[PDB]
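Q: What does the assembled structure look like for these inputs?
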Amino acid sequence: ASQEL
Amino acid sequence: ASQEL
Amino acid sequence: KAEKILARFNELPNYDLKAVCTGCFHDGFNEVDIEILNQLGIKIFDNIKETDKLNCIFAPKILRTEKFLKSLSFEPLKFALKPEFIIDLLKQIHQININLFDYEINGINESIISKTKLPTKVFERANIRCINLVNDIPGGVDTIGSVLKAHGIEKINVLRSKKCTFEDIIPNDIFKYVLIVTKASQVKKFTKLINDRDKNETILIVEWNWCVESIFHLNVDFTSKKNVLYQKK
Amino acid sequence: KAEKILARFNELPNYDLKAVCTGCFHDGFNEVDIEILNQLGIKIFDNIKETDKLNCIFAPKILRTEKFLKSLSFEPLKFALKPEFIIDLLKQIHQININLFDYEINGINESIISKTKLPTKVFERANIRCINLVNDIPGGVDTIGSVLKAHGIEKINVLRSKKCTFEDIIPNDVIFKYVLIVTKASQVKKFTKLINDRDKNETILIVEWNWCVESIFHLNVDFTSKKNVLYQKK
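A:
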């Protein structure tokens, strides 16, 4: 899944 | 002035 | 001096425009006005030179000028803007927030602009490489020739309408013979010459407007009949 | 096949969307559903490529993903839409009246969307051009670097915090002479000392990553804000 920053 | 073709 | 006016700005955008104007700004704005423009990454040229890599055209609307027609063979064309852009921009300068999206020329959409990135020119795509052009073409052979060459035509053979023989006609080295003509008298002369000397070969004869509309769509529509005076295929 | 599905319609709208999704649709949709979308002028790319000229982002809410943050440097960003748009759309497809107004991501108003039309990027506007980034930044330098460059930063100089000397620090050449993005207070002390030893009279700005994230969400660097600023000398 896409990494949140 | 500019010639329109 | 333009620095002074531009000193009061915290930061300046770089519009990265290399442009010509047609139908507007027919020499310039004052020396400060242009100096400001260069500082904003906007450079305006007098004429179109292929190695300047122009990317912009300012014009009030789609026009049939040599410059406008030639802007459709920029590599690529990135922006086709109304002069209101330079005007609203200079007005603001005398933060800077004038944008490159609120000044589109009507009819010059993305689909068309993006055809200028293609690795071919419109007539090259169409396999129209060498053509014959009547000497009485409105605008004159020199200019019309320059527009056609900018758009992929490798050879322009000018034909003295009244006096020319079959030997003067060059082939298109697909239509074997392609001619751009002015009047019906000319259609009949040329079709007769070619059919006498090279009967089984193909011929396309069009009006100047056939080329103009091809350029405005950056596509030669061979199914279109408008501006096509004669075709044997 | 999709064509058959779409044969049943008198006329199809052209939504004209070039989108990425973030926080949603993490592969694609079935092949029919995808072919339908393209017929309706909706194209969804896997990743953001500057020359596809994306204009849309689908997301359930304001997110700190690379994709969301980058969508704020689209040229311009035109739509920031909840996934419910595509959902309602396909539901109806399986006349078409789903509209582009009933699905705004809450918190992303027109005032912010409109800033993406500005002829500058947010950090470019702020005269933040070259920065130094500590190697141990959460997310990793390659990503955080890519986001920052999408937003007008030209040079990203990575500093191995533990090792780096003053000579490794690049100035912000375009105004803060030195801009650094850091993680630890242990790094603020090191860097202020180095710079203050070697370039005493010059200006320094040291911030947390969150300072960049807030600037991006607002498409504005607010220099009067002390939020996320760890040290400044001006």
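Chain B is about 0% helix and 0% strand.
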